Write a protein that binds this DNA or RNA. Structure first.
Ligand SMILES: [Mg+2]
Ligand SMILES: [Mg+2]
Ligand SMILES: [Mg+2]
Ligand SMILES: [Mg+2]
Ligand SMILES: [Mg+2]
Ligand SMILES: [Mg+2]
Ligand SMILES: [Mg+2]
Ligand SMILES: [Mg+2]
Ligand SMILES: [Mg+2]
Ligand SMILES: [Mg+2]
Ligand SMILES: [Mg+2]
Ligand SMILES: [Mg+2]
Ligand SMILES: [Mg+2]
Ligand SMILES: [Mg+2]
Ligand SMILES: [Mg+2]
Ligand SMILES: [Mg+2]
Ligand SMILES: [Mg+2]
Ligand SMILES: [Mg+2]
Ligand SMILES: [Mg+2]
Ligand SMILES: [Mg+2]
Lengths: 126, 100, 82, 151, 115, 208, 99
RNA sequence: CCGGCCGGGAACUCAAAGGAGACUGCCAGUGAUAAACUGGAGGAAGGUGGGGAUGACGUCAAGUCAUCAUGGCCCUUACGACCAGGGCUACACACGUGCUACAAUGGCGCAUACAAAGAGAAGCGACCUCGCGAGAGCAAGCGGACCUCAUAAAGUGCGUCGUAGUCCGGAUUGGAGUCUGCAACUCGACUCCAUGAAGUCGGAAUCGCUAGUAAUCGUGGAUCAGAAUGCCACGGUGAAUAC
RNA sequence: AGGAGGUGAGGUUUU
């Protein structure tokens, strides 16, 4: 029995497949350490597993595409949370308490006319 | 714009379409690596004797209604003012203002 | 600048007028409007008045002016300070 | 600002020590979004400070923060056409923010060759009750005590 | 540590040190080092004299301070004597490659000078 | 000049397009030029006949013109004496075979283009602008419209200073997109100058 | 083995056209892969709205070229004749190829 | 054959079409039994969920007679028409808007990951050969979820420079060159070899910003034979503060 | 809701 989850971010998408195992991690035919150099990303991805003690019991395979390092980490975390909810459904009340069930919605605001950036209005002088 | 400007533009288009092949042959001769050093010189000699209006680089893109040189758009073939005027009335299919 | 393989640029209306004068010996000041043409060694020794925009500025071509553009030796806009 | 009450936003803790003051400090020190470089510099400075003072990195940072922390600040009241700078007590969150900002400014003004070394030296001086950060704190306290006559 | 009549600092690496000459840059320094079989992590010091001799021999293949400036001055004087537009701009102290003189011409105009 | 075109803003939702042909970048400019030429020819020829709209389609490299007008009898002729000539000239201009269709505009007082043209004709015939506007508003409100607005601007009554007058009857919601708004303009060229007329008509909101 | 690409400006008109084509294929044959939506071309233009000095005031228009693909695996002679036989309304262009 | 590549699948991202949903719908409290306000239950989003288009009678006799149309005045062997050259890019100056920077949160060298959105037929231009390099030659593919533009950069690891007008800064200048264009002198863009100015955080004063915002890093497109640090959009990292 | 005590650029022109 293989459980499934999907997560998204600003411009990324991550599919996560969970199986009962010994906690090994595979991401895009690679490893978490080789993929995410910064450990803040490792902390983000392992945060649900640190919150609920299921680290050494779930082997997961993850495919991710789009966005940056933080976006991919967030999408992976969301997919892992969805997979855990499908697995047990009793952890939703605790994950929502920490904010893992709720889905990121902040997006890059579009550029407008007359402004050098999204909100950076040009300099003013009489 | 001006009737004189439009006449100049149409005359230049006609000359370019008439002399396109002859100028292309001379350009190929000039760009050919294996060519006679005197034939390549005579090529430019003959090329510079042709009228200047017969070159695609001398014709400006104007509006087919007025002839405004600035603000021209190639897909619509009109100026920015005329494109907006046509779009607001519906003469251009699928050209609706949208937001994202 | 100009591509080396294409070669120097010169108008026939000046090339013919200078190649005739080479053998004619008519060293009277020639007049021309083509300031975009290069200077060939056969021109050396002649006086050419080139159109700067208002009138014709005379120039006596020397040996050191071969690869230089002809228009470089004719001022276009008058300036004398403020 | 004028009408609404601003709810705080969630701040992600740092992985090296699991704290939030360190995350706020690296956010303050970060410029142009170079959070990775800021975290590396802060980690190196904390390790140097710990190996110097014998304490842990978190304890050393906490004692330095406590030493830099002020208690009062001078602010303008403007009853009428008067520039009365009236002192008032400062919330602990703003105290921590001001202390971190002063530490960052002192480290930037330091003349060493590395920002990590500057920050470590400034933290050591703050823990030992010396440096431009504690001088700024003393100046603020002296101004408040001079304006103590204003409630 | 003396090459081409000038002195060269010893604490710097060879590539940086060779750039101190008028006419030698990073490319012409790396080429000389590769031709002479000298690495780039070494300084002017900690080296023998045959290496410096062959470095001077390889540098002699180029144009350096003694002849570099003479050629530049001769070209500038030739332009000025001929009277070309570029020579006239050099005479007047103005950009010669084609720029704007209405504003932002301080490099050739010199320091700011009011009326 | 701070208002947007209602017909241009309601193209996506309610209002249809006046040209429903498809092409690419290589053909768009030529098709637009040909459409402009044929529209200019038709609006210059059928001036007497009340013509409302001209739709153009280009399927199977042939041109299909559909004229919505209020005077089909005089538009067409006796037995095809004028429609055949119009088809021939349109085909000659476009370089492709042409098919012309005629549609009758019932209740001509409820069409913005026809009312604007009538007002322009009256203005160039020296009829009072206020009288013309009131007559048009009353007629359009009594034939079954939920709202009308008429505006006239520039050199009214032969005065030396221009002005902008307008009348409203009912409701004309311009900020509502689902509302069926019919809007058009017209220009009158009198000896005193140029006068502009704008007409807005409301025909009820649309659901779908 | 026969592929037809339909481009249009109206997602309803193109849907009607592809539905008619699918009905014709199901009548004169079978084994239709079904209509597959292809990426829509969003071509955007930005123009000025004033004939004089006004830069911050602009209008942004867009064109949404919708695209559909239909694949047929049993192209009988009558099916091909009917496909060439039938014509569609304006605003939709159909390209037919074997592959 | 280690590349979804090849049989194969309708599960997934995703491509688009049609729908559900977020509407103060509930709970508790306050409130004039009301409108209405505070919290939380669920929920992806809670109070306009975020952003954009949409800009009310009207002022500024505001701007455009040079987009265009047009009342009136003006010349009709010239205020009209054609061509060559030059100019619109001048220069003792003063002003605004922006780019590069003044340096170690850095420069330089090697190695190595993660994107989005768009253009392409007088076009985009693989692979290969040559040139250190802009680029030159043969020549596929693509009217385009296929092919090209097109390697994303900042980022990370390993080293060097060790606070100096510096291995920062590239201005200006000389020479040798490439591309487009009949024709790069006055005036195009880019490459190489050198030259390496002023500048070390900036006075009175002033500008933008309350969240994926500011700041910073790249990418694409319109214009265009060629010519943006401008303009319009895209994403990557990513804040502090609001008594 | 009643009574009592204070309380504002210190100045800064013309069009
Ligand atoms: Mg601007
Ligand atoms: Mg302004
Ligand atoms: Mg005209
Ligand atoms: Mg051009
Ligand atoms: Mg220039
Ligand atoms: Mg508007
Ligand atoms: Mg509204
Ligand atoms: Mg709530
Ligand atoms: Mg005025
Ligand atoms: Mg004028
Ligand atoms: Mg100008
Ligand atoms: Mg380094
Ligand atoms: Mg090579
Ligand atoms: Mg790096
Ligand atoms: Mg440098
Ligand atoms: Mg160099
Ligand atoms: Mg705001
Ligand atoms: Mg270009
Ligand atoms: Mg951005
Ligand atoms: Mg007075």
């Amino acid at each position: 029995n293989q459980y499934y989850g999907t997560g998204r971010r600003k411009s990324s998408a991550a599919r996560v497949f969970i199986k009962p195992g010994n906690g090994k991690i595979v991401i895009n035919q690679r490893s978490l350490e080789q993929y995410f150099g910064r450990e803040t990303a490792r902390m983000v991805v392992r945060q649900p597993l640190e919150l609920v003690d299921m680290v050494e019991k779930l082997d997961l395979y993850i495919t991710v595409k789009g966005g940056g390092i933080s976006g991919q980490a967030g999408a992976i975390r969301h997919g892992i949370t969805r997979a855990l909810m499908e697995y047990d459904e009793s952890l939703r009340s605790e994950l929502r308490k920490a904010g893992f069930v709720t889905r990121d919605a902040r997006q890059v605001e579009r550029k407008k006319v007359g402004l050098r950036k999204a909100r950076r209005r040009p300099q003013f002088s009489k | 714009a001006k009737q004189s400007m439009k006449a100049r533009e149409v005359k230049r288009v006609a000359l370019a379409d008439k002399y396109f092949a002859k100028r292309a042959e001379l350009k190929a001769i000039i760009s050919d690596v294996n060519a006679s050093d005197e034939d390549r010189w005579n090529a430019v000699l003959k090329l510079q004797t042709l009228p200047r209006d017969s070159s695609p680089s001398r014709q400006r893109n104007r509006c087919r209604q007025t002839g405004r040189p600035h603000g021209f758009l190639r897909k619509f073939g009109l100026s920015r003012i005329k494109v907006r005027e046509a779009a607001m009335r519906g003469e251009i299919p699928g050209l609706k203002k949208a937001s994202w | 600048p100009r591509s080396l393989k294409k070669g120097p640029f010169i108008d026939l209306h000046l090339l013919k007028k200078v190649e005739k004068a080479v053998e004619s010996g008519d060293k009277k000041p020639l007049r021309t409007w083509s300031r975009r043409s290069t200077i060939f060694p056969n021109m050396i020794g002649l006086t050419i008045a080139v159109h700067n925009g208002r009138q014709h500025v005379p120039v006596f071509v020397t040996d050191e002016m071969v690869g230089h553009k002809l228009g470089e030796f004719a001022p276009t806009r008058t300036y004398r300070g403020h | 600002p004028r009408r609404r009450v601003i709810g705080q936003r969630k701040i992600l803790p740092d992985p090296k020590f699991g704290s939030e003051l360190l995350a706020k400090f690296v956010n303050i020190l970060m410029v142009d979004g170079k959070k990775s470089t800021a975290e590396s510099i802060v980690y190196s400075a904390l390790e140097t400070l710990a190996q110097r003072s014998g304490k842990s990195e978190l304890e050393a940072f906490e004692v330095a923060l406590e030493n830099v922390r002020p208690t009062v600040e001078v602010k303008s009241r403007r009853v009428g056409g008067s520039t009365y700078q009236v002192p008032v007590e400062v919330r602990p969150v703003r105290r921590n923010a001001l202390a971190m900002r002063w530490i960052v400014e002192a480290a930037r003004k330091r003349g060493d060759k590395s920002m990590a070394l500057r920050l470590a030296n400034e933290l050591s001086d703050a823990a030992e009750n010396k440096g431009t950060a504690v001088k700024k704190r003393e100046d603020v306290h002296r101004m408040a005590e001079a304006n103590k006559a204003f409630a | 540590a003396r090459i081409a009549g000038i002195n060269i600092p010893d604490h710097k690496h060879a590539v940086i040190a060779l750039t101190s000459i008028y006419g030698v840059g990073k490319t012409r320094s790396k080429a000389i080092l590769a031709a002479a079989g000298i690495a780039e992590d070494v300084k002017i010091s900690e080296l023998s004299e045959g290496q410096i001799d062959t470095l001077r021999d390889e540098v002699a293949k180029f144009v350096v301070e003694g002849d570099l400036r003479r050629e530049i001055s001769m070209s500038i004087k030739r332009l000025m004597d001929l009277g070309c537009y570029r020579g006239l701009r050099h005479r007047r102290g103005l950009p010669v490659r084609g720029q704007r003189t209405k504003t932002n011409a301080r490099t050739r105009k010199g320091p700011r000078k009011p009326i | 000049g701070q208002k947007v075109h209602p017909n241009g803003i309601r193209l996506g939702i309610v209002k249809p397009w006046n040209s429903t042909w498809f092409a690419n970048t290589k053909e768009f400019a030529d098709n637009l030029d040909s459409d402009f030429k044929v529209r200019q020819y038709l609006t210059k020829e059928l001036a007497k006949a009340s013509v409302s709209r001209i739709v153009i389609e280009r399927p199977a490299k042939s041109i299909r013109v559909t004229i919505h007008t209020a005077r089909p009898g005089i538009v067409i002729g006796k037995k095809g004496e004028d429609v055949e000539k119009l088809r021939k000239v349109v085909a000659d201009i476009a370089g492709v075979p042409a098919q012309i269709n005629i549609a009758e505009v019932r209740k001509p007082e409820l069409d913005a283009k026809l009312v604007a043209d009538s007002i322009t004709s009256q203005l160039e015939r020296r009829v009072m602008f206020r009288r013309a506007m009131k007559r048009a508003v009353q007629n359009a409100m009594r034939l079954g419209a939920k709202g009308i607005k008429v505006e006239v601007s520039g050199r009214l009554g032969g005065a030396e200073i221009a002005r902008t007058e307008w009348y409203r009857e009912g409701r004309v919601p311009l900020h509502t997109l689902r509302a069926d708004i019919d809007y058009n303009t017209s220009e009158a060229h009198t000896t005193y100058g140029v006068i502009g007329v704008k007409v807005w008509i409301f025909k009820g909101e649309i659901l779908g | 083995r026969i592929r037809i690409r339909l481009k249009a400006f109206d997602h309803r008109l193109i849907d009607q056209a592809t539905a008619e084509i699918v009905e014709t294929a199901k009548r004169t044959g079978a084994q239709v892969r079904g209509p597959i939506p292809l990426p829509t071309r969003k071509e955007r233009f930005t123009v000025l709205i004033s004939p004089h000095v006004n830069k911050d005031a602009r209008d942004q228009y867009e064109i949404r070229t919708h695209l559909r693909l239909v694949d047929i695996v049993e192209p009988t002679e009558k099916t091909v004749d009917a496909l060439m036989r039938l014509d569609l309304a304006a605003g939709v262009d159909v390209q037919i190829s074997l592959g």
